Design a protein around this ligand. Structure first.
Ligand SMILES: N[C@@H](CCCC[NH3+])C(=O)O
Ligand SMILES: N[C@@H](CCCC[NH3+])C(=O)O
Ligand SMILES: N[C@@H](CCCC[NH3+])C(=O)O
Ligand SMILES: C[C@@H](O)[C@H](N)C(=O)O
Ligand SMILES: C[C@@H](O)[C@H](N)C(=O)O
Ligand SMILES: C[C@@H](O)[C@H](N)C(=O)O
Ligand SMILES: C[C@@H](O)[C@H](N)C(=O)O
Lengths: 387, 160, 392, 159
């Protein structure tokens, strides 16, 4: 019986909550489980540290940044260790091989691991700094835990945002892929990279609250291995944090998309949902649309406008009042009519669909941000996700 | 912090793409297309619709479906063509799809740039793009598929 | 060569702006032709906040986890100062733990032109001494300075020197240019909290010169260097006056002058973790064969100190336990008072002439300390300062 | 942090202690004692004065000086005995001094406690005490020096 428990900043905001969590950790041990614990920095510390970083050095070097964020994490880990020790558990902190943790687990110790470059396979390519989520699932993978519990003030994954959709329901369960897609086009309960790690190693994840004893939502099993007759629609996600930029009149020949996205990458614009449809046979030209965070919208336009005046395309458009709504579900892979019903739902609340993008288990559209509530509500009840 | 994985490259040549040209950008128009396809019980996968033009108020809608259904799909839509709406319906059963699969790619725009640059350098032309945080997909000629995969494998040091 | 180790306190590193300023100061020191080792305290008041979190999550925090917690706090500063220094063109190398950092690894890095940032170094002691508690940033800075035979160890903060008295209380108080190790320890033992005592003791043990200076100005500050023994008798002087009103005075009346009785008092106090100081006991009476034992402790600890000793009054055989929390401490320090008669006389006369009553007296070879009413402290400090013509 | 170091044990037997008994606790009285010694050019080291008693408002002042100046000091003070209404001036040229030398000992009351406990366990009586953050000094019979020093070395693991 091996449980990995990760606790986010919200779960560790104060001494009182650190002690509460510690008893929660000890209870899990008492219930007959070996326990490995991973802690984020105490609520908001990370954001404060990133802001110090940027102020002391624009473009902070990766080495010192990791050093910085690891220090933040170590604070929580030392405190949680102290709290566990006070409730009679024997604590062991790690700064760090799976074997060494296993040794310590076998002596009955609750292991607190701050962080380790975590790769699933020798070939995969890894980018950025490993965070708490991914060290937690990596540990869960390496030690072959039965579940990797992700604790926060979020108590599950819902079929929509409950404040907007009153019939929203906490999901019992969903597959890695379905969770990957929801998190791709909406708020991130967990880091995407970490869920993908989970998927690769088949580590079940449990999203649950450190404030209640609700058992939360299970993320387990691949979508491939769910039989077609079981496959269902999982949920609806919305987002109003993005701008959309469209480059009009790019000539359809090799290398032109590269000009657009190299210019954006060099300015560090976090682009997404790139979309390009077929060029017109007449003109030999097409358009490319993408979304970026609204804060990046200005610089994206300044960059692409320079290139427009160099003559690479006809125009560049900027739109910062756009929203996106999505439907995700393994159930839509093999069943015709889901797309039709999606479009029908928004038609019936007189919502115009501006742009459409897709994965095999997801439909996403862009609309006016003011139409989001209506759209989400219409889709949710059209597909009967909890009423 | 802003972490991502590039896990692999996937190809496919199982699909056709159908493009409905010049549909009116108003509520209910996409519904007509996909309801028709639904009633014929044609299962589709990719849907692509960019923003309508200021001049005409129309866009195009492209979708992919199993290559055997493509012709029937094109004919079903042609039946409703100009019949109070669109300008043309196209059909293409030689379309290939190549994808970079991974997670967290939004916070590394260099990946998207490098994807495009890889296909440029082996002189492959990109006809459609559809991307997300977890997948960068493009549609090209099925003949270019092998070169594309190879170029992407080399660019991102995945190797297959 | 020219090897300078620099320690920067929390006040020096309280913000991003200050860290960049410090970074430029670190780089300027490099540019002036020195090898540079840097030691950072946690930013601002981090250490106090962390210590508060620690006590709230575990009433008796384990030493191991505490070291981890405090080291994390310091690592934050280290990372930031490393980033700031790299933006200014220097090449930073970061080290940790006592030997990781061997002096050899640091010397190697310094030889490659790197500015070295270090944390957690209590020495490579393979010096028969007993160590207590966790070594702080001051101690690792002087330990590194000892190990690498640095030319100076600079301690930076918002304090720009060691003064002859508190300039707020005595107008004519002035910055000292230099003083000996022993003079510094004596000052710091009775009021001056500008340096950790253990770190200064280390400094004199390995003869490492220290410079107390400000990170907010270019003032060179005060040098702490040389043994007091090596000062020529003719040029040995009185160095400063120090005051303190943070303490309470507890007195145990009527202890039997036989072995083990002092132990009964101080064991009881030690088990309650009451931080006692200035223990004072004079000769017993011979009629009654009893004496009194007085000590000081922080005012916050006084009530507890009294509760403990009162219980032992009833059980044991003491006559009484007194409590006093309006007491003040004034002191005079100086190598010049060794081997020079009349210093004690002038000290007492000074206080007499401003009508200040001397309630308790204690001394070292080069220090006179007296307890008085706290309300008399300012007058005492001025009078002593004036009498001995300190700082002009 | 609360860091401290214990660096060693010192012994000495080069001094005498003189005690002025029953000096009145008012401004100017200590001055008379130390000006007299000063005028005779006697150089002193230790001075200990504990708080005065409520019953008669007097206290004692003990000081140490080189053994060769002791009697002369104790004779300079006798001409002040009646003026100051003192009870007596004691003399003792057989006093030894043992110290534990260190730094930062305030934050470790256990050290002081253990200092006293070590001397108890070797049956040495502590006659006077004067401590600080950097030195714990006691005055004892000179014949107890060796045993005290030895007991301290063991207890604190110096030597
Ligand atoms: N296969 C479903 C969903 C397609 C959109 C997602 N790939 C349909 O034909 O409606
Ligand atoms: N020596 C302590 C405190 C230094 C002075 C205050 N910043 C430490 O470990 O950082
Ligand atoms: N030796 C000086 C000072 C003594 C007090 C400090 N030991 C004097 O006799 O006046
Ligand atoms: C173009 C098509 O998507 C239209 N805007 C609709 O909402 O149906
Ligand atoms: C339009 C853009 O996708 C172009 N076909 C390219 O390959 O760069
Ligand atoms: C009075 C006290 O110092 C006692 N003589 C002891 O040695 O314990
Ligand atoms: C006893 C003696 O110290 C007296 N209180 C004085 O001030 O002179």
């Amino acid at each position: 019986a091996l449980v990995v428990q990760k606790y986010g900043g919200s779960s560790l905001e104060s001494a009182e909550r650190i002690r509460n969590v510690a008893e929660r950790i000890v209870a899990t041990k008492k219930a007959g489980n070996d326990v490995v614990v991973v802690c984020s920095a105490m609520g908001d510390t990370t954001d404060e540290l990133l802001e110090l970083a940027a102020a002391v050095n624009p473009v902070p070097p990766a080495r010192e940044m990791d050093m910085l964020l690891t220090a933040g994490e170590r604070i929580s880990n030392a405190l949680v260790a102290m709290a566990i020790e006070s409730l009679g558990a024997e604590a062991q902190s790690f700064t760090v091989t799976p074997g060494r943790v296993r040794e310590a687990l076998d002596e009955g110790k609750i292991c607190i691991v701050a962080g380790f470059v975590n790769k699933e396979t020798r070939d995969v390519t890894t980018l950025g700094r490993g965070g708490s989520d991914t060290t937690a699932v990596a540990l869960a993978a390496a030690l072959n835990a039965d579940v990797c519990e992700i604790y926060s003030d979020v108590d599950g994954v819902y079929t929509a945002d409950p404040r907007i959709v009153p019939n929203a329901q906490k999901l019992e369960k969903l597959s890695f892929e379905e969770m990957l897609e929801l998190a791709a086009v909406g708020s991130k309960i967990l880091v995407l990279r970490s869920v993908e790690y989970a998927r690769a190693f088949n580590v079940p994840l449990r999203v649950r609250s450190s404030y209640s004893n609700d058992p939360g939502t299970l993320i387990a099993g691949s979508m491939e291995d769910i039989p077609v007759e079981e496959a269902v629609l999982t949920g609806v996600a919305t987002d109003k944090s993005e701008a959309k930029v469209t480059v009009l009149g790019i000539s359809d020949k090799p290398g032109e998309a590269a000009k657009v996205f190299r210019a954006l990458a060099d300015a560090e614009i976090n682009i997404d949902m790139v979309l390009q449809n077929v060029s017109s046979v007449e003109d030999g030209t097409t358009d490319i649309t993408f979304t970026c965070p609204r804060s990046d919208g200005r610089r994206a336009m300044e960059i692409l406008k320079k290139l427009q005046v160099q003559g690479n395309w006809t125009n560049v458009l900027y739109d910062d009042q756009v929203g996106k709504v999505s439907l995700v579900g393994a159930g839509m892979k093999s069943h015709p009519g889901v797309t039709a019903e999606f479009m029908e739902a928004l038609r019936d609340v007189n919502v115009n669909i501006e742009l459409i993008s897709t994965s095999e288990i997801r439909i996403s559209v862009l609309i006016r941000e003011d139409d989001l509530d209506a759209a989400a509500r219409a889709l949710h009840e059209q597909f009967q996700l909890g009423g | 912090m802003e972490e991502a994985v590039l896990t692999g490259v996937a190809t496919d040549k199982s699909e056709a793409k159908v493009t409905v040209l010049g549909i009116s950008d108003k509520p209910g128009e996409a519904a007509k297309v996909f309801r028709a396809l639904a009633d014929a019980e044609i299962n589709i996968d990719m849907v692509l619709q960019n923003v309508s033009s200021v001049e005409d108020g129309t866009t195009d809608i492209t979708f992919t479906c199993p290559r055997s259904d493509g012709r029937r799909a094109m004919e079903i839509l042609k039946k409703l063509q100009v019949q109070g709406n669109w300008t043309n319906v196209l059909y293409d059963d030689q379309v290939g799809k190549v994808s970079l699969v991974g997670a967290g790619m939004k916070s590394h725009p260099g990946v998207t740039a490098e994807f495009m640059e890889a296909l440029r350098d082996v002189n492959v032309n990109i006809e459609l793009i559809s991307t997300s945080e977890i997948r960068i997909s493009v549609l090209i000629r099925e003949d270019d598929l092998d070169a594309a995969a190879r170029a992407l494998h080399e660019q991102f040091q995945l190797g297959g």
